[model samples]
Target chain A: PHLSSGEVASVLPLGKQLTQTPSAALFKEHRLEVMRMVLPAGKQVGSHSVAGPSTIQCLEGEVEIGVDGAQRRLHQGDLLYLGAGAAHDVNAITNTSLLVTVVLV
Target chain B: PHLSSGEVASVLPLGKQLTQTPSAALFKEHRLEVMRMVLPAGKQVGSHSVAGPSTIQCLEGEVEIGVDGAQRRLHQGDLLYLGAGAAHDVNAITNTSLLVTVVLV
Candidate 1:
């Protein structure tokens, strides 16, 4: 939650904090929202939709992203984009951390 | 440049493409713009400002981000936020790759 004027924050996972099912908010502004979500292996994030375009960047590990009947494997350094109202679900192939950004217009 | 409705793109540096001074566009919707930038060591990106809130995520390596009158080192997995019109400059401490997201509202 370091959404200040010039705040610098670390997104690296914490040894103890990673077990808390963290969905840490990195930034939340009128036009944008950034969150760091930890998805443990074998865990699935239920289908969800964003009102605006969104980008999900895999920080570490691997994940399976399902959208519009297609599934894509996202490895570290991979990025995925979805259009507005696009329903999607994420499943962790390994313990993963994703940096998700949404345009909140 | 993968900006299609459901494009899954990899931001990992290509073996030879890394020499092109690449500034790859990941997404460019009306309300959002994301770019994957490669900053070679000893190089500097002169002062610049975003019209809206922006975020700089360090994908790999290290960088020195100077905002206002302060300087901070952003290492791998680190994130920095800047308010609208907040000018900043970046210098690579090592060859680095950055994921930059800006609200284009």
Candidate 2:
């Protein structure tokens, strides 16, 4: 009978994130988390391993995703999948926004 | 080392779905499935339950997601969470596209 339980929140902005300094969480459960991240052009996150499996969908602009030593450019609506503990890095080729969900094992 | 094993595939069109007939799967892992769905304006999917929990993120246009009697209008980039076996229905208020990941328990 009801459309939904809560407000019609925009996932992109509900959790505020800055260009390089900050990223915010949108939702979380026992094993899953939804995050909205923003990055300035040329900004990067150093090589690292995740706690678990993750999927990322680009929302705005573009990003250079690095795994091993290769790079992949992801544009809006493009998605990347990484296995648990996959070593990876992210660099913004353009000012970019991404919707990412991580699932813990 | 490669950024990823695959190619620069666009998640949106790679798994194409017509306005009504067929929706396509984009990627699948054990217990997890990613899908791309397209719907014609005013189309609806009957109320049903899933085998597991699922999260939906709108990629294009809008949808009215119905859970029991509750409904929510989702636009591009909006997401909804549903528990396992949750009964729900979907209606496209406009030509719509959605990215849904289902995690089988």
Candidate 3:
């Protein structure tokens, strides 16, 4: 008769909505993971691939997502989807925070 | 050569930030599906279960999530996780918009 014996959390707060912040794991359960990722301008995540389908959503600032061989810029509130095992990379065009969610097998 | 030949979309926009709107599917790929769900106040979603693990994140307004036998309220910017196949029910305490992400098998 309990709320699953887990906790509920807030990933964003009023004062922190517009603030630059560190990356953090927001939640994880079984085959799911939701994370808040922070990257500094010019930082890069070289070639990588997720085993499951995923999404990279820009929460603030701007970022460039590279998949296949082309790059697309993501502004705040924009969400990009990557199919399972899609090779991709990321570069921060500006200091940025992203909501990254992955669905694992 | 391409960004997976897929699309990137926005779920929230500054102009629509506070506007109440209809529910819509935001993104889906293979084993993942992300949706914007809208519920009117007093609406009730009877007990049900999702075969996969999922997250219900409040984007606007409030909702009460009942699990097992306890109820937890989620406000804007709040997030809760449910284990795979966990039975739950949702009740809208106010006109609400939820960002619901599910990992399908």
Candidate 4:
């Protein structure tokens, strides 16, 4: 997979600032996590990586997702998948709230 | 923790059949999982237990969830948290699709 680096989440046009709810344990197994994120107009979550694959489900508003150098935009009810170790970024196209799951294999 | 028994996923009114997409790894972390479930009107997913806490997000339709014998009906946009080892059940109010996440702590 291609690995592209740079400020992927920062290039979006106008919208809300990005704020992420700090990560917390969802279960005692230490393999899964659920995070609540609020993106303000134009805010972005810069490129990042995880130990395992992750999925992003847009609960409200819209978001642009960059994974492994590929980008996809998702709206409410839409889902995006990012492979483990892939560099990723998220930018809100509008004020958005989303749930991200990182699952251990 | 309360260790309730019996069929939790069963017991519901009219609806479709309940089908689970099975379990799959989400990341390389060995901790998270994502399962897709399709619940038919009137169908229920019998009570079950996990090693860790879990969350249910209703993607479409309605579902009645029983946690430790307490029941809550969830519509789209509704979220439920079930503690690890908590026996739980799910029944569909209508044809529904949902995503259930079990996270290792």
TM-score of 1: 0.88
The CAPRI category of model 4 is incorrect
The global C-alpha lDDT for each of the candidates, from Candidate 1 onward, is 0.83, 0.70, 0.76, 0.58
Record all residue pairs in model 1 with backbone atoms less than 3 Å apart, i.e. clashing. Answer: none
**TM-score of candidate 3 relative to the true fold:** 0.82
Root-mean-square deviation of each candidate, in angstroms?
2.3, 4.9, 4.2, 12.3
Clashing pairs in 3: A69-B1
Per-residue lDDT of model 3, residues B23-86, tens digit only: 7787655677788788877889999988888888777788999987578898877778788887
Q: Write the per-residue lDDT of candidate 1 for residues A1-105, one digit (tens) a residue.
A: 457867887876544556575778987877778898898888898889989889898877889999886898998878898888889999999888888988886
Candidate 4 global CA lDDT score: 0.58
Candidate 4 wrongly placed segments (more than 4 Å): A1-30, B1-31
* lDDT of model 3, residue B100: 82
Q: Model 4: what is its DockQ?
A: 0.11
Docking class of 1: medium
Best candidate (score: TM-score)? 1
A1-105 in candidate 2: lDDT tens per residue?
A: 111322233555322344443566766666566777878789899988767667887777889988764687898767887766778888999888877778756
Off by over 4 Å in 1: A13-17, B13-17
Q: What DockQ, on C-alphas, does every prediction get?
A: 0.73, 0.36, 0.48, 0.11
Q: How much is the lDDT of residue B76 in candidate 3?
A: 73
Error of 4 at A102 (Å): 3.0
Candidate 2 chain A — worst ten consecutive residues by lDDT sum? Answer: A1-10
* Decreasing lDDT order of the candidates: 1, 3, 2, 4
TM-score of each: 0.88, 0.79, 0.82, 0.66
What overall lDDT, based on C-alpha atoms, would model 3 receive against the true structure?
A: 0.76
lDDT of 1 by residue, B14-62 (tens): 4455557677888787877888889888889899898988899887788
